[PDB]
DNA sequence: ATAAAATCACCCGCACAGATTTTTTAAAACGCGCCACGGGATTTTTAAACCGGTATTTAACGGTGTATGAATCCCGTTTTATCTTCCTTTCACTTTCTTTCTCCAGT
């Protein structure tokens, strides 16, 4: 939902990782930054999904 | 696989406190020498003991009114007895490197 509003879609230029880690943990997610950042690490390997 | 909490090396200038490192200086020492000083044997002089006597000067003695010495209670100081420790050391074990002995396929 994140990326979504961000208006971070598909045929766009890319974005850093760290502002939509900002942008959840700021907004959304009330925990730490890291477990953040290894769920969306995990979400973009080709062997794991 | 999602959560909670943590840790370390280096680069760039500048100012200063502390730790080696030369460098200089005053004290202690050695060798040689000479003359200042003290020992020994005469002359000389004077310090103190001794007789007086006199004229003071001190210490022992009897009342008052304190200042302090021994005793008690504490708390910082230094000694002494008492624990743990890291480097030296070998040493039996393990590992790893070097040479040798075959196999052995090919012709």
């Given at each position: 939902?994140?990326?979504?509003?961000?208006?971070?879609?598909?045929?766009?230029?890319?974005?850093?990782?760290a502002?939509?880690?900002?942008?959840?943990?700021?907004k959304?997610?009330?925990?730490?930054?890291?477990?953040?950042?290894?769920?969306?690490?995990?979400?973009?390997?080709?062997?794991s999904?």
């Amino acid at each position: 939902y994140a990326m979504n509003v961000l208006g971070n879609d598909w045929n766009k230029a890319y974005k850093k990782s760290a502002r939509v880690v900002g942008d959840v943990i700021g907004k959304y997610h009330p925990h730490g930054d890291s477990a953040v950042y290894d769920t969306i690490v995990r979400m973009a390997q080709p062997f794991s999904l």
